[PDB]
Amino acid sequence: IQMTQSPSSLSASLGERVSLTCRASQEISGYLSWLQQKPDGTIQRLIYAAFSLDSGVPKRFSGSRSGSDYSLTISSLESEDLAHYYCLQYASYPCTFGGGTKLEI
Amino acid sequence: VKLVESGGGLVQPGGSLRLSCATSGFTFSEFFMEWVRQPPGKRLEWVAVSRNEANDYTTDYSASVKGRFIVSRDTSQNILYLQMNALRAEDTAIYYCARDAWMGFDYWGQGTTV
Amino acid sequence: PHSLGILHASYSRQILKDVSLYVESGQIMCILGSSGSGKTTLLDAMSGRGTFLGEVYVNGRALRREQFQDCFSYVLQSDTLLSSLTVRETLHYTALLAIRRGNPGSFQKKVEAVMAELSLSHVADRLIGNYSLGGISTGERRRVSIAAQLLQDPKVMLFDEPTTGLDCMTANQIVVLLVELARRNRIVVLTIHQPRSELFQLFDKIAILSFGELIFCGTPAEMLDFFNDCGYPCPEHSNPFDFYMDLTSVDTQSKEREIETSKRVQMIESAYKKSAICHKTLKNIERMKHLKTLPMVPFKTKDSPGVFSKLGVLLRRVTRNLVRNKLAVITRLLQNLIMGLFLLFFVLRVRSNVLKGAIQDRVGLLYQFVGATPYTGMLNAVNLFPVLRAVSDQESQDGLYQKWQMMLAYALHVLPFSVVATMIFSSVCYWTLGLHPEVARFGYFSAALLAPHLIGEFLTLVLLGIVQNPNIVNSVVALLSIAGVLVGSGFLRNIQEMPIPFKIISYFTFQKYCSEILVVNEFYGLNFTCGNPMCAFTQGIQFIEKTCPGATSRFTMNFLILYSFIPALVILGIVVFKIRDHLI
Amino acid sequence: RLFSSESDNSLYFTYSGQPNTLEVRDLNYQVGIQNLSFKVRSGQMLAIIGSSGCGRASLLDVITGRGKIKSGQIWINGQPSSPQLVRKCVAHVRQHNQLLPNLTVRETLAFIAQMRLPRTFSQAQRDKRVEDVIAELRLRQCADTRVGNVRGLSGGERRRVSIGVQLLWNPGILILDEPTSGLDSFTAHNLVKTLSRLAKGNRLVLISLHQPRSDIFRLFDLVLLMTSGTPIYLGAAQHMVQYFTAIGYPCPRYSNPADFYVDLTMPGAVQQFTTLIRRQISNDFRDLPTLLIHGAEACLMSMTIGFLYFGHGSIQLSFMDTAALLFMIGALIPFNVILDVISKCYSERAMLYYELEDGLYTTGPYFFAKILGELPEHCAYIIIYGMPTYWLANLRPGLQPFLLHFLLVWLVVFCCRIMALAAAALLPTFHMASFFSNALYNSFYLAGGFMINLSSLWTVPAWISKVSFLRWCFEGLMKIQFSRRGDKILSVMELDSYPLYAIYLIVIGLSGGFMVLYYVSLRFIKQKP
Ligand SMILES: CC(C)CCC[C@@H](C)[C@H]1CC[C@H]2[C@@H]3CC=C4C[C@@H](O)CC[C@]4(C)[C@H]3CC[C@]12C
């Protein structure tokens, strides 16, 4: 299963809303998660199962599914949003990651 | 739940290396333990997995490194060990040590550059 | 020696793709394949049953798509036979339908010959019945079918899974019998779903079909040789049949394994096409075609007999099948009697001396009879026809007879039984109820209750001939009879006041004429007393004029109109049955 | 290397507890099975090959307790076998899958977990159990796909869903009857590998298979060869040949050994009721063709009754015409109602029997669940059949008579539905049940007060009409239509000795009696297919 992530690069500032898209070649039935890599090297999962959020994460991130496209929408952009973002599927073996997204402001 | 990695360096092709992953805050025998590297040209690729006590501590690796990479675990100190043989061909990455793969990759570590 | 050769055959979205085979007499060829192999389509193509390419050489002569029926025999998998018949009687009926020479001597000779050839002489005079009630075994039924097919003395036979649905005992025995028939100077091409390991060395040739493509065809020894030359040796104790089936099958559970299996199958097919076996088969075909020293195509035994002869044979067959089954006759003769007894248990008399319930009970009796006779006819038709319909549409593809002839014979054999049943029900229920005791009125009532029974029976027969599911036909006929007895009859609607569309619909139903006849026959010469609310009908003539004013002058005509609904529909059924041979 | 091997060898849902055992010592079965004796422990996979089964029951059925009286002794976990012990420790997966088509995998698994897990478990625990069951059988790519027989899933996917349903309560002993029946070779190989992976944990899995041709025999752990009820070999399959050659029966080259040796010879009642009614509603409201056919036939019959007795126009409807119209309105619905109810009941008989025998519920919540599930669509049918005909026939105008007619028709059709339910629960086959139902319907039809005056009945037909809902419906409609307009026409007849509320109470009592009969039939009669 190949995961196509969009966009590869994006430019935004304070206050606006961003929406990243992940597309799967097959059906995963909503078994998708989102990973965030900080510039220092710290990786942390923000959303699991594409609809539920983890403990200790701000309430500005959310996830939705339209057809076969999983959309991660972040509202009220702040300084904590300059990082890399990836989508991950775990419904089939082996697990494959996304292309990546350079969220720079 | 804390995962810290150590043991990275620079090694010429043809040698061997062993990285360590220290875990804290959870039961080491009741959860999986995965090694997932991230080379610079690469995006993200999982390389090694070790199952819990229910699977007789069985290990598995991807076809890209099947036969050269060996993962092991020490339950007395809850330490993951990753032994790589014949490195530096295309095995330059920032290898990360994670907990769960089938239930979503959560509680990542810091990664060590090899 | 005879020969069969299929050259560059194709069928179309496409089921066959350049299939070519070569079989000789004295040998047996088996065909294997998966769900999407297309072996049944190939068998139907060689048997002659929507474009077909390639040519079929029999004894060197290139036969057209029309002469496939006169040379190739086909044994089906359904194996449907009549329960209340024996082996000898069924074989004699089949021979009479196929062979027409003269005295029954040759018929009996052929029957005992084909029975002793296939070990059917010890069960020759035993009823078929069912294998779950004590009748003959399933292997005996298959042997009876093979004997009925062999009665025409064929040379090339096809078998559509003769081992499925049976035990290993019966499967092995039938395989041995097919090898016997093939070694007895005949060509036999059979298909097997899951062959066993001991049947590997029994067949002379083995072919494999995959998505319409011929993967391999040859002797089992040459099969093992070619399979080990390719690089896939068969491991020991692995049932090479299943191994070579899975090696030439496609695994469609993912999109990568499917491509891998497709590439493997294509590589094996390409290696087989560039081998010496295919070239040898092609040169053998084109050499046997241009020999010009061998005899021509051996055809069947006898022509097709006349229409009247086949009709009489089918009538005698269905009569013997119905008489030997006591349950069906008892039901056909007692359904109306049980209905009449159930109605008498509720009514038990009509009070012809007071207006409290005279007209009410009489109208109720007439309505119940008119609504119950087509119900019983439809019940009988649904209970007795489907087996005969299965026999007919199974035996019509063999060129024996037609389906409309079977329907006509069914009608002819159900006419007298229904007549007797209606007469008995009337003679038992009419006099006790005290409904104008007379003889001419009794006969008129008997006829007016017999005609709608036959009408409904023929309607249900046509519907079962055009529709497959018996329950849908039952429900539709029940609803139609209810609508007819509700609208056409003027008991509850006062047709003189119903709307125009319903008035037009009422003219096409037999219930209107039946109710008019019954009212004219019942309320003609009877008197009534009420000793204001309903006493405006002291005489039956007033109630007649209220229900149907001018019916007393159209009595006889009405009868004719009733007798105009029985035969015409039958004719329509014939046409319907014609559509049958265009729908299967 | 011909079969798929790029699979995951991880175990996501294992068994926690002590290892289970199963002992059979000198068992004999009659009405065949002679001297059966073996011992299996948790962690091993036993496959019984050969000709197993005397009659309609298999060997697993007679060792588990179904089926014909045993003459041996069976030990389950050290204790002797018992129906409650088998229900508590043994799970069974037959060869015929019986699942609701209009449901998905996740919803069905959640319903089974809610009906199986105790009441003390939280919703998070049930969700985690469902997720573990899904990930264990690799059903993550079809968790949102319906199990409809409709495209739905495949055969192997449906088998995996059934295994997950039977494995939700974490059984210690699992038994399967022909799991690879009707499946492809690759699908059967994958299913056998999945069963072996399930047996790899701390469970005791038994399988009944007829012909392990090439690979099913090679993937076996322990095999039991049976011939006409007599055992021949008991041990590892990979050494079976090495055993027979040790006796003097070698297996020929290029021949399957198996065939060659065979031919030679908590949670509560309210929660269960809620889950049952929710599942029934979710399965019924997603069947578009059936609802459309019901609505179409209802509208057709109602509108043709309205147009046949069209009251508007030049001439008005007479007295006898109105009587016939009311009688037809009362007597036309029961046929289609009974047919639909009998079909819907016999389409669920095997599933109901399996759910009642496995111990999900005990005939308490299923009754009210079926009643409240059939109630809404039946009320819609009643609306469509009764309201768009009162105006076409130009009956008595007003709100109270119209509402009373609607309520009476609804109650009569509900009584007919309950009678059809009781007739379905009383007889095991469709034909005899339909015949008895139509007989009762025609008896109540002849007991009406429209054809035989309701007075020419001596003892028995009068008593039949006293319990005939059609007669009471006709009398109520006559009293609603003609009384206070008017009473003398009902007085010269015999339809004025019972008021309206009395007829309503009689209809309610008949409905209650039919409900009691249906409950007794469900509780005391087995719904065998
Ligand atoms: C095992 C399977 C085949 C069950 C069979 C159910 C069949 C026999 C039942 C279920 C659906 C029913 C049909 C569906 C509804 C209608 C439409 C109505 O205007 C004519 C009656 C008719 C056509 C019913 C006839 C009886 C029926 C055919």
Helix (H, G, I), strand (E, B) or coil at D227: strand
Q: For residues D195 and D211, give the distance between their C-alpha atoms in angstroms, rounded to a whole number.
A: 17
**Structure tokens that stand for C506 in this block:** 């009422």
Q: For residues B56 and B50, give the distance between their C-alpha atoms in angstroms, rounded to a whole number.
A: 10
Considering only the beta carbons, identify the residue of A43, A48, A90 that sits closest to B108.
A43
D292 lines ligand 1 (CB under 6 A): no
- The amino acid that residue D148 corresponds to is G
Residue with tokens 């018992």: D82
Do the Cβ atoms of D141 and A28 come within 8 Å?
yes
Helix (H, G, I), strand (E, B) or coil at C190: strand
D336 lines ligand 1 (CB under 6 A): no
SS (H, E, C) chain A: CCEEEECCEEECCCCCCEEEEEEECCCCCCCEEEEEECCCCCEEEEEECCCEECCCCCCCEEEEEECCEEEEEECCCCHHHCEEEEEEECCCCCCEECCCEEEEC
Spatial CA neighbour of C238 closest among B19, D157, D529, D254:
D254
DSSP C19-65: EEEEEETT-EEEEEE-TTS-HHHHHHHHHT---EEEEEEETTEEE-S
**A46 phi and psi, to 5 degrees?**
-100, -45
Q: Answer positive or negative: Cα dihedral of C88, C93, C94, C96.
A: positive
Helices (H), D285-429: 288-308, 319-346, 349-358, 365-390, 400-426
Closest ligand 1 atom to residue D300 Cα is 19
Q: For residues D528 and D346, give the distance between their C-alpha atoms in angstroms, rounded to a whole number.
A: 10
Helices (H), D397-497: 400-426, 430-446, 460-466, 469-482, 487-492
Q: Do D128 and A52 meet the contact criterion of CB atoms below 8 Å apart?
A: no
Helix (H, G, I), strand (E, B) or coil at D36: strand
The yes-or-no reply on C/D contact (3 CB pairs or more, < 8 Å) is: yes
Atom 13 of ligand 1, nearest CA residue: C472
Considering only the beta carbons, identify the residue of A43, A95, A99 that sits closest to B101.
A95
Give the single-character DSSP code of C303: -
Chain centroid offset of residue D367 CA: 13
Count CB-CB contacts under 10 A for residue D382.
20
Helix (H, G, I), strand (E, B) or coil at D230: strand
Please enumerate in sequence order all residues whose Cβ is within 8 A of that of D372, keeping only pairs 6 or more positions apart, or say none: D277
Residues of B with CB under 8 A from a CB of A: 43-46, 62, 94, 96, 101-111
**Ligand-binding site membership of C275 (annotated):** no
Q: For residues C541 and C549, give the distance between their C-alpha atoms in angstroms, rounded to a whole number.
A: 9
Count CB-CB contacts under 10 A for residue C229.
11
For chain B, the farthest-separated pair of C-alpha atoms sits apart, in whole angstroms, at 38
Q: Do B68 and B86 meet the contact criterion of CB atoms below 8 Å apart?
A: yes
Q: Which of C464, C467, C468, C475 to mutate to test the pocket of ligand 1 (most atoms within 8 A of CB)?
A: C475
Chain D residue closest in CA terms to B61: D8
**D92 phi and psi, to 5 degrees?**
-125, 135
Spatial CA neighbour of D372 closest among D284, D292, D434:
D284
- Distance from the alpha carbon of residue D418 to the mean position of ligand 1, in angstroms: 20
Please enumerate in sequence order all residues whose Cβ is within 8 A of that of D1, keeping only pairs 6 or more positions apart, or say none: none
Experimental technique: cryo-EM
Residues of C in Cβ contact (< 8 Å) with D442? 342
Q: For residues A43 and A60, give the distance between their C-alpha atoms in angstroms, rounded to a whole number.
A: 18
C475 lines ligand 1 (CB under 6 A): yes
Question: What value does the CA radius of gyration of chain C take, rounded to a whole number of Å?
Answer: 32
Count CB-CB contacts under 10 A for residue B114.
20
Spatial CA neighbour of C473 closest among C567, C338, C576, C364:
C576
Q: Do C540 and C527 meet the contact criterion of CB atoms below 8 Å apart?
A: yes
DSSP B44-107: -EEEEEE--GGGTT-EEE-TTSTTTEEEEEETTTTEEEEEEES-SSS--S--EEES-STT---S
Helix (H, G, I), strand (E, B) or coil at D91: strand
Spatial CA neighbour of D411 closest among D269, D515, D295, D301:
D515
Q: Do C148 and C128 meet the contact criterion of CB atoms below 8 Å apart?
A: no
**Structure tokens that stand for D234 in this block:** 């008991």
Q: For residues A44 and C80, give the distance between their C-alpha atoms in angstroms, rounded to a whole number.
A: 70
Edge-to-edge strand list for the sheet holding C156-160? C72-75, C156-160, C187-191, C28-33, C205-210, C213-218
**Structure tokens that stand for C1 in this block:** 């020696």
C472 lines ligand 1 (CB under 6 A): yes
Q: For residues D437 and D416, give the distance between their C-alpha atoms in angstroms, rounded to a whole number.
A: 10
Q: Do D46 and D40 meet the contact criterion of CB atoms below 8 Å apart?
A: yes
**Ligand-binding site membership of C309 (annotated):** no
Do the Cβ atoms of D307 and C499 come within 8 Å?
yes
Residues of C in Cβ contact (< 8 Å) with D217? none
**Ligand-binding site membership of C36 (annotated):** yes
Q: Which of D297, D304, D431, D438 to mutate to test the pocket of ligand 1 (most atoms within 8 A of CB)?
A: D297
Q: For residues D453 and D493, give the distance between their C-alpha atoms in angstroms, rounded to a whole number.
A: 8
Residues of D in Cβ contact (< 8 Å) with A31? 140
C-alpha distances in Å from residue D286, one per residue of B39, D289, D373: 50, 9, 13
* Residue of B2, B5, B34, B44 to mutate, testing the A interface (most A Cβ within 10 Å of its Cβ): B44
Q: D21-265 belongs to which homologous superfamily?
A: P-loop containing nucleotide triphosphate hydrolases (3.40.50.300)
**Structure tokens that stand for C102 in this block:** 């003269």
**Which class for C55: exposed (0-12), middle (13-18), buried (19 or more C-beta within 10 A)?**
middle
Considering only the beta carbons, identify the residue of C239, C492, C499 that sits closest to D213.
C239
Helix (H, G, I), strand (E, B) or coil at C122: coil
Q: Answer positive or negative: Cα dihedral of D427, D429, D432, D434.
A: positive
Considering only the beta carbons, identify the residue of A26, A30, A93 that sits closest to D8.
A93
Residues of D in Cβ contact (< 8 Å) with C239? 213-214, 255-256, 259
Helix (H, G, I), strand (E, B) or coil at D54: coil
Do the Cβ atoms of D451 and C497 come within 8 Å?
no
D296 lines ligand 1 (CB under 6 A): no
Closest ligand 1 atom to residue D339 Cα is 26
Spatial CA neighbour of A26 closest among A98, A86, A92, A101:
A92
C-alpha distances in Å from residue C122, one per residue of B62, C119, D120: 69, 7, 71
Resolution in angstroms comes to: 2.9
Do the Cβ atoms of D144 and A93 come within 8 Å?
no
Chain D residue closest in CA terms to C472: D339
Q: Which chains touch C (3 or more CB pairs under 8 A)?
A: D
Chain centroid offset of residue D348 CA: 3
Considering only the beta carbons, identify the residue of D256, D315, D446 that sits closest to C497.
D315
Residues of B in Cβ contact (< 8 Å) with D135? 102
The number of C-beta contacts closer than 8 angstroms across B and D is 16
Q: For residues D136 and D239, give the distance between their C-alpha atoms in angstroms, rounded to a whole number.
A: 31
Do the Cβ atoms of B54 and D14 come within 8 Å?
yes
Asked if D142 is an interface residue toward chain A (Cβ–Cβ < 8 A), one would say yes
Q: Do C441 and C554 meet the contact criterion of CB atoms below 8 Å apart?
A: no
Cα end-to-end distance, chain A, whole Å: 31
Q: For residues C450 and D164, give the distance between their C-alpha atoms in angstroms, rounded to a whole number.
A: 61
Please enumerate in sequence order all residues whose Cβ is within 8 A of that of D514, keeping only pairs 6 or more positions apart, or say none: D415, D418, D419, D421, D422
Q: For residues D298 and D389, give the distance between their C-alpha atoms in angstroms, rounded to a whole number.
A: 11
- Distance from the alpha carbon of residue D343 to the mean position of ligand 1, in angstroms: 8
**Ligand-binding site membership of C38 (annotated):** yes
Q: For residues C450 and C452, give the distance between their C-alpha atoms in angstroms, rounded to a whole number.
A: 6
Helix (H, G, I), strand (E, B) or coil at C187: strand
Count CB-CB contacts under 10 A for residue B99.
20
Q: For residues D109 and D167, give the distance between their C-alpha atoms in angstroms, rounded to a whole number.
A: 10
Residues of D in Cβ contact (< 8 Å) with C257? 4
Count CB-CB contacts under 10 A for residue D244.
19
**Ligand-binding site membership of C39 (annotated):** yes
Question: H or E element: which one contains B5?
Answer: strand B2-6
The number of C-beta contacts closer than 8 angstroms across C and D is 131
Q: Do D103 and D146 meet the contact criterion of CB atoms below 8 Å apart?
A: yes
C-alpha distances in Å from residue D383, one per residue of D293, D380, D401: 16, 5, 15
**Ligand-binding site membership of C197 (annotated):** no
Q: Do D359 and D267 meet the contact criterion of CB atoms below 8 Å apart?
A: no
Do the Cβ atoms of A27 and D141 come within 8 Å?
yes
Spatial CA neighbour of D60 closest among D216, D176, D180, D213:
D176
- The amino acid that residue D346 corresponds to is Y
